[PDB]
């Protein structure tokens, strides 16, 4: 269903693209690792290195991200943590 | 309770320390995020930035890590993903 953003430090444009790419991934892949890998790789290509993606129903995370390059959101039961580092 | 390493690119010494810091964290915090946080922060201080930690029972992930600075392991039912970037 409709993505629910639970934390962000990111521009609207980049956010929308991450959400779109993530939704597209869900039409093709069910395994969390598959979903994470396709999002990560697409963002590396489109926006430059280095991106990291976690997809799951149960995790806690503590990471460092470039400013303006962080978003954490649900699509359905799946949480997505997507962020960029040097 | 004995840690089980599932995947790694790491030296034995750094691995042993990460495992040790992680077990200690379990004695001290009830939330996955806080376990991840204390491990992340301790590694930043001890080994230099920048570390990232995910702790959970259900997730897939695709990340990029500095050579020799990645370990993925379980302690009991809990999975730990620990890695370093620049």
């Amino acid at each position: 269903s409709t993505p629910i953003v639970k934390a962000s430090d990111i521009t609207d444009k980049l956010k929308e693209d991450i959400l779109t790419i993530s939704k597209d991934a869900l039409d093709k892949y069910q395994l969390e690792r598959d979903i994470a890998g396709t999002v990560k790789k697409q963002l590396d290509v489109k926006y430059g290195n280095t991106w990291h993606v976690i997809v799951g129903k149960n995790f806690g995370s503590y990471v460092t991200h470039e400013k303006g390059h962080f978003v954490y959101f649900y699509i359905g039961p799946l949480a997505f943590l997507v962020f960029k580092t040097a | 309770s004995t840690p089980i390493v599932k995947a790694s690119d790491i030296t034995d010494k750094l691995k042993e320390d990460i495992l040790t810091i992680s077990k200690d964290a379990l004695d001290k915090y009830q939330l996955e995020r806080d376990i991840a946080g204390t491990v992340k922060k301790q590694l930043d201080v001890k080994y230099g930035n920048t570390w990232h930690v995910i702790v959970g029972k259900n997730f897939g992930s695709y990340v990029t890590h500095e050579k020799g600075h990645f370990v993925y392991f379980y302690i009991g039912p809990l999975a730990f993903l620990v890695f370093k970037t620049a």
């Binding site: 806690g60 962020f83 | 996955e32 995020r33």
Partner: peptide, 11 residues
């Protein structure tokens, strides 16, 4: 510039 984020899934 860089910043730290801590997150806990709902479940």
């Amino acid at each position: 510039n860089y910043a730290e984020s801590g997150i806990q899934t709902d479940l």
